[PDB]
Structure 1
Amino acid sequence: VSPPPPIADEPLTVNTGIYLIECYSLDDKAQTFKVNAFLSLSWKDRRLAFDPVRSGVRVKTYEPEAIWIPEIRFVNVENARDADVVDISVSPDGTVQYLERFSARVLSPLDFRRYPFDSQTLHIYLIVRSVDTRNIVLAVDLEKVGKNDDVFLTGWDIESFTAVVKPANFALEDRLESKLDYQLRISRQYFSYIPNIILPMLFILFISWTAFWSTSYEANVTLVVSTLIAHIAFNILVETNLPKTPYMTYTGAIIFMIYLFYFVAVIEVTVQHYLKVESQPARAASITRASRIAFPVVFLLANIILAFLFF
């Protein structure tokens, strides 16, 4: 079968729609998400047109093999989508109404700069390649774009599912391609990160600062070195949940900065002990008393600077 013939030099408009049924498996490391949705397609085929009086029927149901169907693909997928045709209905003016239910693993990059207080715009790119007989252009039927109420994405708040109505028409290998952009706006549920990573990480840091109220070098060494090892464990835990980024993330910046605080606390603990052994505890006492104020003040100000730079 060949595509429908053009009245004038006009291209063939294929009206599209995506209705999300299930949304799942958003892999932060892979930058992928899995989708289960309806894909609706509509175009006019004058060759399929019929008399309602003469034929008796108001609409004709065809099997995919019986009629011409546009080769519609997704750009940003891993493998060709798993699809199952639900219905094909032809009106007697030749207006075809196609509906399929599909599942695909969509590849969409994420911006981790503000992690875990980040928001994302996931994309689903629909595409059609023009044939030699005719040029095919995609359009959005807004009445056929949406999502089910029950659609949930573990660890995410689904904000909106909309389509950029104007297609990106371009040439690829000397043929017109009509590309449509479907956008799923999400925002991370940061809640769990507070009692599981942030608050624990702060507690161990504050425990290391108790060395500023101790003259016992052996105890101070144990306090600062032990809490530093727990901080290393939290750093490893965080980086296993995230992919390697060519930029600094918000959590990554805080985690990295806290290492500098542990390093300076080791210097303070060392300086204090050296002075005490040198019979200079009065100078050591001045440094330790200053450290009690300096460490929390510099930590608070550095975090204000970080929060300002990132948000």
Structure 2
Amino acid sequence: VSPPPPIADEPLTVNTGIYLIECYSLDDKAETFKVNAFLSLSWKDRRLAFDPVRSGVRVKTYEPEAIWIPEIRFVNVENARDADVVDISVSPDGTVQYLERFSARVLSPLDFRRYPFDSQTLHIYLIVRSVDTRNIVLAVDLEKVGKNDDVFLTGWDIESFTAVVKPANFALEDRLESKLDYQLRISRLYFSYIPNIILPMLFILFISWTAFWSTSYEANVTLVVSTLIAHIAFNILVETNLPKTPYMTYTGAIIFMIYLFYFVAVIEVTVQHYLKVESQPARAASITRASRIAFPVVFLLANIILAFLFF
């Protein structure tokens, strides 16, 4: 089977449409997401036209083998989609109505700089390589584009499944290629963030600060070092629930600052001691009393600057 010849110097337009049946398995690491959906295509193959009175039928159904179907592919798929033809329906003028059900692991990039307040746009790029006998351009049939209301992505809000109606046609390896963009907007919904990650991580840091209402260097050391280990222990626990990135996340910035607040604390404790040791206990208690208000206020301000810096 060969492409349908053009009556005039015109390209064939293939009216696309993707309906998400079930969208799942979003790999925050691999920047992948698996989607099970419907692809719909329509074009005019005048060779396939018929007289309905003579044929005794209003619409003829054909097997993929039997007729010409355009080589539609995806740019950002891992390996080729696991498609299965659902229906092929030729109207008496030659307007083929194709529908397939596919499932493919897509590769859209993810940004976690604002984690756990991050929001994504998941791309699904449709392409069609123009043949040597006639060029092919894509088009979005807005009716045949949608999503099932039951489509669920646990911990995310599935905002909208839209499509840039504008196909960015370009040249590749001395041939025209028509490219459509299907964008799936999702926004994070991490509820348990504060009780699971921040709130307990804050208490461990606060427990460390009880070393300013103490003067025992033996108690002070246990207090600061022990809480530091408790901090690292808890970080190991929330390793799962955290973004594993080559850049700095919003949450990653907070965690880092907390490591520093342990470091500064130890300095205070060591100073408070070395002053008392060197018999200057005025400046010793002056520094401890200061820290009481200093450490918290500074932390608050720092976390404000920090926050606004990302948002």
Contact 2:113 2:310 in 1 (8 A): yes
Per-residue Cα deviation, 1:52-73 (whole angstroms, up to 9, x for no partner): 1111111000000000000111
1:223 Cα shift? 1.6
Instruction: Name the counterpart of 1:108.
Output: 108
Distance 2:243 2:264 in 1: 29
Summarize the Cα distance change of 1:238–1:76 in structure 2 as closer, same or farther, 3 Å threshold: farther
1:230 Cα shift? 2.6
Residue 158, structure 1, aligned to residue 161, structure 2: no
Q: Which is further off, 98-107 or 238-247?
A: 238-247
Distance 2:164 2:233 in 1: 44
Q: Which is further off, 190-199 or 228-237?
A: 228-237
Instruction: Name the counterpart of 2:281.
Output: 281
Distance 2:238 2:306 in 1: 18
Per-residue Cα deviation, 1:197-249 (whole angstroms, up to 9, x for no partner): 11111111111111111111122111211221232234445555556534321
Number of positions where the alignment pairs a residue of Structure 1 with one of Structure 2: 311
Contact 1:28 1:242 in 2 (8 A): no
Contact 2:18 2:40 in 1 (8 A): yes
Per-residue Cα deviation, 1:247-271 (whole angstroms, up to 9, x for no partner): 3210011111111111000000100
| 3-state SS of 2:238 partner | helix
| 3-state SS of 1:69 partner | coil
User: C-alpha root-mean-square deviation of aligned residues, in Å?
Assistant: 1.2
Superposed, 1:161-240 pairs within 5 Å as 161-238=161-238, 240=240
Summarize the Cα distance change of 1:238–1:131 in structure 2 as closer, same or farther, 3 Å threshold: farther
Summarize the Cα distance change of 1:237–1:179 in structure 2 as closer, same or farther, 3 Å threshold: farther
Contact 2:11 2:136 in 1 (8 A): yes
1:152 Cα shift? 0.3
Q: Which is further off, 49-58 or 242-251?
A: 242-251
Per-residue Cα deviation, 1:158-217 (whole angstroms, up to 9, x for no partner): 000000101110111111111110000001112122111111111111111111111111
Contact 1:19 1:148 in 2 (8 A): yes
Contact 2:162 2:184 in 1 (8 A): yes
Instruction: Name the counterpart of 2:13.
Output: 13
Contact 2:122 2:183 in 1 (8 A): yes
Per-residue Cα deviation, 1:67-89 (whole angstroms, up to 9, x for no partner): 00001111101100101100000
Distance 1:87 1:242 in 2: 44
| 3-state SS of 1:157 partner | strand
Instruction: Name the counterpart of 1:41.
Output: 41
| 3-state SS of 2:21 partner | strand
Distance 1:181 1:235 in 2: 39
Contact 1:157 1:186 in 2 (8 A): yes
Contact 1:30 1:243 in 2 (8 A): no
Instruction: Report the TM-score when normalising by structure 1.
Output: 0.97
Q: Which is further off, 236-245 or 223-232?
A: 236-245
Contact 1:29 1:241 in 2 (8 A): no
* % identical aligned pairs: 99
Contact 1:29 1:242 in 2 (8 A): no
Q: Which is further off, 222-231 or 194-203?
A: 222-231
Distance 2:247 2:155 in 1: 23
Contact 1:28 1:241 in 2 (8 A): no
Q: Which is further off, 236-245 or 110-119?
A: 236-245
Per-residue Cα deviation, 1:253-295 (whole angstroms, up to 9, x for no partner): 1111111111000000100111112222221110001000000
Instruction: Report the TM-score when normalising by structure 2.
Output: 0.97
Summarize the Cα distance change of 1:249–1:45 in structure 2 as closer, same or farther, 3 Å threshold: same
| 3-state SS of 1:166 partner | coil
Distance 2:223 2:12 in 1: 73
Summarize the Cα distance change of 1:121–1:61 in structure 2 as closer, same or farther, 3 Å threshold: same
| 3-state SS of 1:98 partner | strand
Instruction: Name the counterpart of 1:78.
Output: 78
Contact 2:81 2:103 in 1 (8 A): yes
1:149 Cα shift? 0.7
Summarize the Cα distance change of 1:245–1:94 in structure 2 as closer, same or farther, 3 Å threshold: same
Distance 1:100 1:242 in 2: 38
| 3-state SS of 1:167 partner | coil
Instruction: Name the counterpart of 2:144.
Output: 144
**Which stretches in structure 2 are left out of the alignment for 5+ residues?**
none
1:50 Cα shift? 0.4
Per-residue Cα deviation, 1:31-62 (whole angstroms, up to 9, x for no partner): 11010000111111100010111111110000
Summarize the Cα distance change of 1:93–1:101 in structure 2 as closer, same or farther, 3 Å threshold: same
